[PDB]
Amino acid sequence: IPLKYGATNEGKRQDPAMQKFRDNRLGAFIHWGLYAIPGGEWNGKVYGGAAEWLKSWAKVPADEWLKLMDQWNPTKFDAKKWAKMAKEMGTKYVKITTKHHEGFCLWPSKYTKYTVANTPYKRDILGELVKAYNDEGIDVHFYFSVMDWSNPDYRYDIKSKEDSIAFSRFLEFTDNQLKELATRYPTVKDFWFDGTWDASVKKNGWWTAHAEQMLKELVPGVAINSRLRADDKGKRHFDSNGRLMGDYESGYERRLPDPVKDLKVTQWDWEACMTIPENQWGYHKDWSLSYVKTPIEVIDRIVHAVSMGGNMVVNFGPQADGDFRPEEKAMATAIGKWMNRYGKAVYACDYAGFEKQDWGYYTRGKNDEVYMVVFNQPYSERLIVKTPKGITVEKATLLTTGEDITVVETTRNEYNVSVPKKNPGEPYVIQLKVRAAK
Amino acid sequence: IPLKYGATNEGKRQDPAMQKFRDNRLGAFIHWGLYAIPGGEWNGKVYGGAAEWLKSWAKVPADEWLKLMDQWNPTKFDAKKWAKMAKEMGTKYVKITTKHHEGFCLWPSKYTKYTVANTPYKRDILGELVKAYNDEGIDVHFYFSVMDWSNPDYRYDIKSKEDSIAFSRFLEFTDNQLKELATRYPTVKDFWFDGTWDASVKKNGWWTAHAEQMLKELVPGVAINSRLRADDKGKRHFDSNGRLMGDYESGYERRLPDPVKDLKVTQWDWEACMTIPENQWGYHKDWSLSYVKTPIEVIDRIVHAVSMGGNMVVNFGPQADGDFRPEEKAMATAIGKWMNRYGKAVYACDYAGFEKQDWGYYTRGKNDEVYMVVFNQPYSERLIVKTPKGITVEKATLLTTGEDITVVETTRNEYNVSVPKKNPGEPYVIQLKVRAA
Ligand SMILES: C[C@@H]1O/C(=N\OC(=O)Nc2ccccc2)[C@@H](O)[C@H](O)[C@@H]1O
Ligand SMILES: C[C@@H]1O/C(=N\OC(=O)Nc2ccccc2)[C@@H](O)[C@H](O)[C@@H]1O
C-alpha cells in the first residue's frame, strides 16, 4: 500500500546514536508533576487509580487542578543527588516527564503559563536534571504527552467544524513546545510520546510523521518511539504494510513478550517500561493498595527484556518535596549492587538465539559471549543448555569469580552446565564460550 | 471411518484395575536375559549400542547366541531381595521382560526349548519374581516381544506363500505363549507388547485386536499397551479415527510430552519408560560410554509424567549373576529416600489444569490438593502461581514439616506463593488449598 506517512526505517537503525540507545539497555523513568502533591488523594478521598490520573479519577476542573502550582516547592530537590541515585543504580539513560496529561511543564515554556516558572520554586527542573544526568555520563530522553488537559483546544475526536479548527490550533501549540524542548536541551537523545491514542491524533497521521521529522531535523540521531505514530489510515505503531513506525516499539508496559511464543520482537528495536507497584507512575502516598515488586522481580524483567533484544525502563515517582520514597531508594540501591556484579550480561547484550530453559535467560555479548542468567537454581546442580544446529559449548566460567564450570554433553545438542560449588545466593551469570560450525 | 479392529475404550477406563494402574504412577522395568552375560561385548569388541540388541549389533547367529543359555547361572539371584529393592525405591509396579527379541524365556514355556528350564539354574525366575513382588504389594506387568529372533517362522513382511504359511505358524506359537503366561501367572496386571512394528504385524491388525481380546478374557481387568495394536488400515497406537487402541499410550522413551504444547496427552492414560544411561536397557558392562542420569534428573522425569497424567517406569538391567550394579542400587535408594518424603505429590496424583511455571510441576491429589513440586528454586523467594479462571490459593504448607507458607496476590489470577520459611534443600513440595465457585 502506498503511504506518505508510514515507516521510515528498513529494519533496525545501525547509526551510532541508535546503537548507543540500544547498548544502554537499562533506563530509569521519572514521573514528576503537580500530581506528586495530592499523591492520589483529593478532598479527603484516596483513589486506587494511578496517581498521575487523579485529575480524571476525582473529576477536578483544570483551573482547580493547575492551582496545585501555587503549592509546588520541592525544597529537598537536588539534581546532583538524583543523578548520583541513577548512576549508583546502573541506569545508562533517564526518561523524564517534560509534560504529562495535566499539561504542567517541568521547563519554563513560553507557550503556556502552566510551568515551573510560575511556582514558588521557579527553577527550570528539566534543565537542572538534563545537566546533572549528563555530567554523570547518563543520556536523557523526554517523555511528552500530546493529550493536554490544560489546553481547551485539545479534542478526543473530530465530530464538528469547531472541533476541526480547535484541534488545528492544538497541533500548532504542540509543535511550538516540541521545537522549544529540542532547541533548549540539544543533549536530548529520544522523544517518548504518550497521549497519542485518541481518534483526533489517529486522523492526523501526517502530523505524527511531521513531528518525527521536525525533531530529527533539530536533533541529530534522536530516537522517536512508535506510540507517537499513526499512518495515512490512522493505524498506530506499525503501518498498514505492518512496518514499524518510529525508531523502536514502545507498546510493552507491564507484560513483556513471551520468551517462546513472541520471538518476532527480536526483528526490531523495542523498549518496555515498568512500575514498581502494579500501576502507579507518579507519586502515590499509599503503596499498600497494590502489589509492590521486589528488586529481584525487577531484575528478572530487565534481563527478560535484554534476552529478547529489548531495553527496560524502571519507573520512579518522586515525592512533592523533591526526595525519593524509602522503597524507591532501596530499589535503586539493590538494582545497582546487582548491575555492578552482573551488568556485563545486560549492557550492550542482545538475543542469543537459544531455546529458553527454566533456570533463567540467555543474553549475547558483542563478541559472541553467551551469558546464562540464572534466576531459578536447580536442585539437580545441572543447568540444561540446548544448542541451536551447529553450535557447541567449548567452556563455561562463573562471571564474578572466573572459576571454570563443568560442561557435560548429555545427548545431541544438549549439555548439563554445573551450578557453582558455592550457591551465589542471588541471580548469577555463567559465561559460555561457543563455536559455530562453518 | 468404519473399523472392526480400532479402539475398544471411549476415553479412560475407570474400573478399579485401571485406577490402580494409574494411581501406582511409578514403575520399574527389568530387562534380564542372555544379553546380561556378554554385557555389550562380543569377541573382544565392546559395542556402544543397547546391550539387549547385541545379537543384532555383532550379527550373532541364533544357534551361537542361544548357547549363552549354557552360562546362565545367577547364583546371587533372590526374588525376595529384588522385591525389597523395588519396595525401598517406592516402585508400585514392575514390568519384567518375559521374553525379549532374543526369544529366551524367563519362564519354563512348553512351546520352546529356549527357557530358564534348559539352563544350569533351571528355576522359574519369572514365577519366583511374580510371588516376591506380589507379597511386597507390588503389581507385576509382562513385557513380551512378538518379534522373536529364536523362531525362524518370524517374518518382517509377507511377500510369498511360504511367508504366509510360516508367519501363520509364528502367530499360533505367539498365542500359545501369551495364553500360557496368562494361565501360569494370573496375578499379571498388564501386557506391554514390543516387536510389533513390522509390516507383518501392521498388515494383521485383526490378530493384534485378537491378542488384546484373548488376554482380557483370561485376565480380568488386565491392561494392554497401545504398542501392540494396529487397526484394519495398519494404523498403529491410534486408529484411523484418531482413537487410542489398548488401554494406555506407550511412547515418550525419547522425550516426554512438552508441558505447554502437548496438553492433549491429559485426555488418555499413558506410560513413559526411561533408561538411566542414554540408551541401555539390558546390562552393559561400561556405563562411561554415555551420560548417566542422577537421581534428581530421574525424579524430574517421574514428576513430569504425573504432572501430565502419565506413569513413568525406570529401567534396571540386572547383572548376569542375579545382583544389581552399584549405580542402580544408589538410584533405587535415592528415589525411595525422596519418594518417602514427597511421594504424596506422585502416587494417585494427576494433571492439575494449571499453566506451567519455571520452578517445576503442578500435580493434583484425589481431594483437590495442588502440589507445587519445586525443582528450580527462585532467588526471588516467590513461586509464581497463575490460577485458571475461577481459582484462588487459600493456603500453602511445607509438605515435610507442617510449616505455613505466605501466599501474596500480585495481579488478577496470579500469586507469589512464598517458598517455605526454610529451604527444603532438595526438590521439595509445597501443598496448596484451592477453591473454585
Ligand atoms: C508511561 C505511562 O504510560 C501511559 N499510557 O500508556 C498506555 O496507555 N499504554 C498502553 C495501553 C494499552 C496497551 C499497551 C500500552 C500514561 O497514561 C501513564 O500515566 C504513564 O505515563
Ligand atoms: C522397552 C525398550 O523398548 C524397545 N523398543 O522400543 C522403542 O523403540 N520405542 C519407541 C520408539 C519410538 C517412539 C516411541 C517408542 C526395545 O527394542 C528395547 O530393547 C527395550 O526393550
Coordinates of C-alpha atoms in Angstrom, one line a residue, chain B residues 43-376:
Chain B
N43 CA 34.7 -61.4 20.5
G44 CA 36.8 -58.6 22.1
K45 CA 34.8 -55.6 20.8
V46 CA 32.6 -53.6 23.2
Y47 CA 29.5 -52.3 21.2
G48 CA 28.1 -48.9 22.1
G49 CA 24.6 -49.8 21.1
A50 CA 21.9 -51.0 23.5
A51 CA 23.3 -54.2 25.1
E52 CA 20.0 -56.2 24.7
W53 CA 20.4 -55.8 20.9
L54 CA 24.0 -57.1 21.0
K55 CA 22.9 -60.2 18.9
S56 CA 21.9 -57.7 16.1
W57 CA 25.0 -55.4 16.6
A58 CA 27.5 -58.3 16.4
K59 CA 25.4 -60.2 13.8
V60 CA 25.3 -63.3 16.1
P61 CA 23.6 -66.4 14.5
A62 CA 20.6 -67.6 16.6
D63 CA 22.3 -71.0 17.4
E64 CA 25.5 -69.3 18.7
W65 CA 23.6 -66.6 20.6
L66 CA 21.2 -69.0 22.3
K67 CA 24.2 -71.1 23.5
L68 CA 24.7 -68.3 26.2
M69 CA 22.0 -70.5 28.0
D70 CA 24.9 -72.8 28.9
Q71 CA 26.4 -69.9 31.1
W72 CA 23.1 -68.8 32.6
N73 CA 23.7 -69.3 36.4
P74 CA 22.6 -66.3 38.5
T75 CA 23.5 -67.8 41.9
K76 CA 23.3 -64.3 43.6
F77 CA 19.6 -64.1 42.5
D78 CA 17.0 -63.8 45.2
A79 CA 13.5 -62.7 44.2
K80 CA 12.7 -61.5 47.8
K81 CA 15.8 -59.2 47.7
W82 CA 14.6 -57.9 44.2
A83 CA 11.1 -57.3 45.7
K84 CA 12.6 -55.5 48.7
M85 CA 14.9 -53.2 46.4
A86 CA 11.7 -52.3 44.5
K87 CA 9.8 -51.7 47.7
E88 CA 12.6 -49.5 49.2
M89 CA 12.5 -47.5 45.9
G90 CA 8.8 -46.7 46.2
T91 CA 8.0 -48.6 43.0
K92 CA 4.3 -49.7 42.9
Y93 CA 4.7 -51.9 39.8
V94 CA 7.4 -53.9 38.0
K95 CA 7.4 -54.6 34.2
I96 CA 9.5 -57.7 33.5
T97 CA 11.0 -59.0 30.2
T98 CA 9.3 -62.4 29.9
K99 CA 11.0 -62.8 26.5
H100 CA 12.9 -60.1 24.6
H101 CA 13.7 -60.1 20.9
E102 CA 16.4 -62.8 21.5
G103 CA 13.4 -65.2 22.4
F104 CA 15.0 -66.6 25.7
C105 CA 12.1 -67.2 28.1
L106 CA 12.4 -66.3 31.9
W107 CA 9.6 -68.9 32.5
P108 CA 9.7 -72.7 31.6
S109 CA 7.5 -72.4 28.4
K110 CA 6.1 -75.7 26.9
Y111 CA 6.3 -74.1 23.4
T112 CA 10.1 -73.6 23.0
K113 CA 13.3 -75.2 24.4
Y114 CA 14.9 -71.6 24.8
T115 CA 13.9 -71.1 28.5
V116 CA 15.5 -70.9 32.0
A117 CA 14.4 -74.6 32.5
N118 CA 17.2 -75.6 29.9
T119 CA 19.9 -73.7 31.8
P120 CA 22.2 -74.7 34.7
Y121 CA 20.0 -72.5 37.1
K122 CA 16.8 -74.4 35.9
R123 CA 14.5 -72.3 38.2
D124 CA 11.3 -70.4 37.0
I125 CA 12.8 -66.8 37.5
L126 CA 9.5 -65.2 36.3
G127 CA 7.3 -67.2 38.7
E128 CA 9.8 -66.5 41.6
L129 CA 9.7 -62.7 40.9
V130 CA 5.8 -62.7 40.5
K131 CA 5.3 -64.1 44.0
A132 CA 8.1 -62.0 45.7
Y133 CA 6.8 -58.7 44.1
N134 CA 3.2 -59.6 44.9
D135 CA 3.9 -60.3 48.6
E136 CA 5.5 -56.8 48.9
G137 CA 2.2 -55.4 47.4
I138 CA 3.9 -54.7 44.0
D139 CA 1.9 -55.2 40.8
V140 CA 3.8 -57.2 38.0
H141 CA 3.4 -56.4 34.3
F142 CA 4.7 -58.6 31.5
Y143 CA 6.9 -57.1 28.7
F144 CA 6.6 -59.5 25.7
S145 CA 8.3 -59.3 22.3
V146 CA 6.2 -60.6 19.4
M147 CA 9.3 -60.3 17.1
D148 CA 11.4 -63.3 18.1
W149 CA 15.0 -63.9 16.7
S150 CA 14.9 -67.5 18.1
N151 CA 12.0 -68.6 15.8
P152 CA 12.8 -68.8 12.1
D153 CA 9.0 -68.7 11.4
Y154 CA 9.1 -64.9 12.2
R155 CA 8.7 -62.6 9.1
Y156 CA 9.2 -58.8 8.7
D157 CA 6.8 -58.7 5.7
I158 CA 4.5 -61.2 3.9
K159 CA 5.7 -61.3 0.2
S160 CA 5.2 -65.0 -0.7
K161 CA 3.0 -68.1 0.1
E162 CA 5.9 -69.5 2.2
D163 CA 6.0 -66.2 4.1
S164 CA 2.2 -66.6 4.7
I165 CA 2.5 -70.3 5.9
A166 CA 5.5 -69.6 8.1
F167 CA 4.1 -66.3 9.8
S168 CA 0.7 -68.2 10.4
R169 CA 2.7 -70.8 12.4
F170 CA 4.5 -67.9 14.2
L171 CA 1.2 -66.3 15.3
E172 CA 0.0 -69.7 16.6
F173 CA 3.2 -70.0 18.7
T174 CA 2.8 -66.4 19.9
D175 CA -0.9 -67.1 21.0
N176 CA 0.3 -70.3 22.8
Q177 CA 3.0 -68.4 24.9
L178 CA 0.6 -65.5 25.7
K179 CA -2.2 -67.9 26.8
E180 CA 0.5 -69.9 28.8
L181 CA 1.7 -66.7 30.7
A182 CA -1.9 -65.5 31.5
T183 CA -2.8 -69.0 32.9
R184 CA 0.5 -69.7 34.8
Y185 CA 0.6 -66.2 36.3
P186 CA -3.0 -65.0 36.8
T187 CA -1.8 -62.1 39.1
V188 CA -0.4 -60.3 35.9
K189 CA -1.9 -56.8 35.7
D190 CA -0.6 -55.7 32.2
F191 CA 1.0 -57.0 29.0
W192 CA 3.4 -54.4 27.4
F193 CA 4.0 -55.6 23.8
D194 CA 7.1 -54.8 21.8
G195 CA 8.5 -56.1 18.5
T196 CA 5.1 -55.3 16.8
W197 CA 6.2 -52.5 14.3
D198 CA 7.0 -54.8 11.3
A199 CA 4.8 -54.8 8.1
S200 CA 4.0 -58.5 9.0
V201 CA 2.1 -57.3 12.2
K202 CA 0.7 -54.0 10.8
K203 CA -1.0 -55.9 7.9
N204 CA -2.5 -58.4 10.5
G205 CA -4.4 -55.8 12.6
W206 CA -7.2 -58.4 13.3
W207 CA -4.5 -60.5 15.2
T208 CA -3.4 -57.6 17.5
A209 CA -7.1 -57.0 18.3
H210 CA -7.5 -60.8 19.0
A211 CA -4.5 -60.9 21.4
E212 CA -6.0 -57.9 23.4
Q213 CA -9.4 -59.6 23.5
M214 CA -8.0 -63.1 24.3
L215 CA -5.9 -61.7 27.2
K216 CA -8.8 -59.5 28.6
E217 CA -10.9 -62.7 28.7
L218 CA -8.1 -64.8 30.5
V219 CA -7.2 -61.9 33.0
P220 CA -10.0 -59.8 34.4
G221 CA -9.1 -56.0 34.3
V222 CA -5.6 -56.7 32.7
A223 CA -4.1 -53.6 30.9
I224 CA -2.8 -53.8 27.3
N225 CA -0.4 -51.2 25.8
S226 CA -1.0 -49.2 22.5
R227 CA 2.2 -50.6 21.0
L228 CA 0.5 -54.0 20.4
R229 CA -2.2 -52.5 18.3
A230 CA -2.7 -51.9 14.5
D231 CA -6.3 -51.2 13.1
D232 CA -7.8 -52.5 9.8
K233 CA -5.7 -50.0 7.8
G234 CA -2.4 -50.8 9.7
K235 CA -2.5 -47.5 11.7
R236 CA -0.6 -48.2 15.0
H237 CA -1.3 -47.0 18.6
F238 CA -4.1 -44.6 17.5
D239 CA -6.8 -45.9 15.0
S240 CA -7.7 -44.2 11.6
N241 CA -10.4 -42.2 13.6
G242 CA -7.5 -41.0 15.9
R243 CA -8.8 -43.0 18.9
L244 CA -6.3 -44.7 21.3
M245 CA -6.1 -48.6 21.0
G246 CA -5.3 -50.7 24.0
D247 CA -5.8 -49.1 27.5
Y248 CA -2.9 -46.6 27.5
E249 CA -0.4 -44.9 25.1
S250 CA 3.2 -46.3 25.4
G251 CA 5.7 -43.7 23.9
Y252 CA 7.9 -40.8 25.0
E253 CA 11.0 -43.1 25.6
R254 CA 13.0 -40.4 23.5
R255 CA 11.3 -37.3 25.0
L256 CA 8.4 -36.7 27.4
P257 CA 5.4 -34.5 26.3
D258 CA 6.1 -30.8 26.3
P259 CA 4.3 -29.2 29.3
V260 CA 2.9 -26.3 27.2
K261 CA 2.4 -27.7 23.6
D262 CA 1.2 -31.4 24.4
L263 CA -1.6 -31.0 26.9
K264 CA -3.6 -33.3 24.6
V265 CA -2.0 -36.3 26.4
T266 CA -4.0 -35.4 29.5
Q267 CA -7.1 -36.9 27.6
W268 CA -5.9 -40.5 27.8
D269 CA -3.9 -42.9 30.1
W270 CA -0.2 -43.1 29.1
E271 CA 3.1 -44.5 30.4
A272 CA 6.6 -43.4 29.6
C273 CA 9.7 -45.7 30.2
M274 CA 13.3 -44.5 30.6
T275 CA 16.8 -45.8 30.9
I276 CA 19.4 -44.4 33.4
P277 CA 22.1 -44.2 30.8
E278 CA 21.1 -42.6 27.4
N279 CA 20.1 -45.9 25.7
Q280 CA 20.9 -49.1 27.6
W281 CA 18.0 -51.4 28.8
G282 CA 19.8 -54.7 29.2
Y283 CA 23.1 -54.8 31.4
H284 CA 26.0 -53.1 29.6
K285 CA 29.4 -53.5 31.4
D286 CA 30.6 -49.9 30.5
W287 CA 28.4 -47.0 31.7
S288 CA 31.2 -44.5 30.8
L289 CA 30.2 -44.6 27.0
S290 CA 27.1 -42.3 27.5
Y291 CA 25.6 -39.8 30.0
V292 CA 24.2 -41.5 33.2
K293 CA 21.2 -39.7 34.9
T294 CA 21.5 -38.6 38.5
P295 CA 18.5 -39.4 40.9
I296 CA 17.1 -35.8 40.7
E297 CA 17.3 -36.0 36.8
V298 CA 15.2 -39.2 37.1
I299 CA 12.7 -37.8 39.8
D300 CA 12.3 -34.7 37.4
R301 CA 11.1 -37.1 34.7
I302 CA 8.8 -39.1 37.1
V303 CA 7.1 -35.9 38.3
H304 CA 6.9 -34.5 34.7
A305 CA 5.0 -37.7 33.6
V306 CA 2.4 -37.5 36.5
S307 CA 2.0 -33.6 36.0
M308 CA 0.7 -34.6 32.5
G309 CA -1.5 -37.5 33.7
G310 CA 1.2 -40.1 32.9
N311 CA 3.0 -43.1 34.5
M312 CA 6.9 -43.3 34.5
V313 CA 8.9 -46.6 34.5
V314 CA 12.6 -46.5 35.5
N315 CA 14.6 -49.3 33.8
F316 CA 17.1 -51.7 35.6
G317 CA 19.4 -54.1 33.8
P318 CA 20.4 -56.8 36.3
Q319 CA 23.9 -58.4 36.1
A320 CA 24.2 -62.0 34.8
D321 CA 25.0 -63.1 38.5
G322 CA 21.5 -62.0 39.6
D323 CA 22.6 -58.9 41.6
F324 CA 22.3 -55.2 40.7
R325 CA 25.3 -52.9 39.8
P326 CA 26.3 -50.2 42.3
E327 CA 24.7 -47.3 40.3
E328 CA 21.3 -49.0 40.2
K329 CA 21.3 -49.7 44.0
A330 CA 22.3 -46.0 44.6
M331 CA 19.4 -44.8 42.2
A332 CA 16.7 -47.1 43.8
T333 CA 17.9 -46.0 47.3
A334 CA 17.8 -42.3 46.4
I335 CA 14.4 -42.4 44.6
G336 CA 12.9 -44.2 47.6
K337 CA 14.5 -41.6 50.1
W338 CA 12.9 -38.8 48.1
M339 CA 9.6 -40.7 47.4
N340 CA 9.2 -41.4 51.2
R341 CA 9.4 -37.5 51.9
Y342 CA 7.5 -36.2 48.8
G343 CA 5.5 -39.2 47.4
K344 CA 2.1 -37.7 48.4
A345 CA 2.7 -35.4 45.3
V346 CA 3.2 -38.5 42.9
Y347 CA 1.1 -41.6 44.0
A348 CA -2.6 -41.2 43.0
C349 CA -1.9 -37.6 41.5
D350 CA -2.7 -36.3 38.0
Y351 CA -2.7 -33.2 35.8
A352 CA -3.7 -30.0 37.8
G353 CA -5.1 -27.9 34.9
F354 CA -2.6 -25.0 35.8
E355 CA -0.3 -23.1 33.4
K356 CA 3.3 -24.5 33.6
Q357 CA 5.8 -22.3 35.6
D358 CA 9.7 -22.3 35.6
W359 CA 10.2 -23.5 39.2
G360 CA 8.8 -27.0 38.5
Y361 CA 5.5 -29.0 38.1
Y362 CA 1.9 -29.0 39.4
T363 CA 0.2 -32.3 40.4
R364 CA -3.4 -32.7 41.6
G365 CA -4.3 -35.1 44.6
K366 CA -7.6 -37.0 44.7
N367 CA -9.2 -34.3 47.0
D368 CA -8.1 -31.2 45.0
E369 CA -4.7 -30.8 46.8
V370 CA -2.3 -28.9 44.4
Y371 CA 1.3 -29.8 45.0
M372 CA 3.9 -27.4 43.7
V373 CA 6.8 -29.8 43.0
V374 CA 9.7 -27.4 43.1
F375 CA 12.9 -28.4 41.1
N376 CA 14.2 -24.8 40.4

